[PDB]
Amino acid sequence: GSSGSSGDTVANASGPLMVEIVKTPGSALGISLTTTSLRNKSVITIDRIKPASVVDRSGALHPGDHILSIDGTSMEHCSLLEATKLLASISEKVRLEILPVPQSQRPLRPSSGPSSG
Numbered sequence: 001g002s003s004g005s006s007g008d009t010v011a012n013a014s015g016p017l018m019v020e021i022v023k024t025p026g027s028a029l030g031i032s033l034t035t036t037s038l039r040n041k042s043v044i045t046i047d048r049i050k051p052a053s054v055v056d057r058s059g060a061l062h063p064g065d066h067i068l069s070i071d072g073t074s075m076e077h078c079s080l081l082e083a084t085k086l087l088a089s090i091s092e093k094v095r096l097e098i099l100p101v102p103q104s105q106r107p108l109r110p111s112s113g114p115s116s117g
Contacts, residue, residue, distance in 0.1 A: 016100075018107060019061065019097070019098045021054055021058060021094045023092065023093065029049075030049070030053050031046065031055060031061060031084075032049070032050075033046055033080055033083050034047035035079060035083075044067050046064065046065045049061055060096075065099070066099040066101065067083065067097065067098055069097035070086040070094075070097060071090075071095040
């Protein structure tokens with residue numbers, strides 16, 4: 001009579017936003033992150049994206065977004081090196097968990113308009 005707890009191992013799917021990006025197989029896009037301070041701890045964010053890339057051409061990530069997690073990696077006690085390593089360790093789609101920001105608050109939103117490129 002000990003241990004147990006049979007329900008779910010962390011499951012919300014409401015707070016953080018999963019910004020997936022269908023990149024090339026074993027290929028690097030060019031995502032640049034930039035960590036900063038606050039008061040007691042720091043936070044990993046996005047510095048800038050690469051031009052003519054899957055993230056830029058698609059418009060998934062953006063400079064300034066607050067990354068909450070990546071591929072199941074909490075961005076509460078991580079660094080720039082660790083985070084950058086996660087983006088490189090991708091098979092096809094990058095599991096980037098970003099906070100609901102005004103710049104991006106949808107995994108698959110419509111894109112209408114004459115020009116787009």
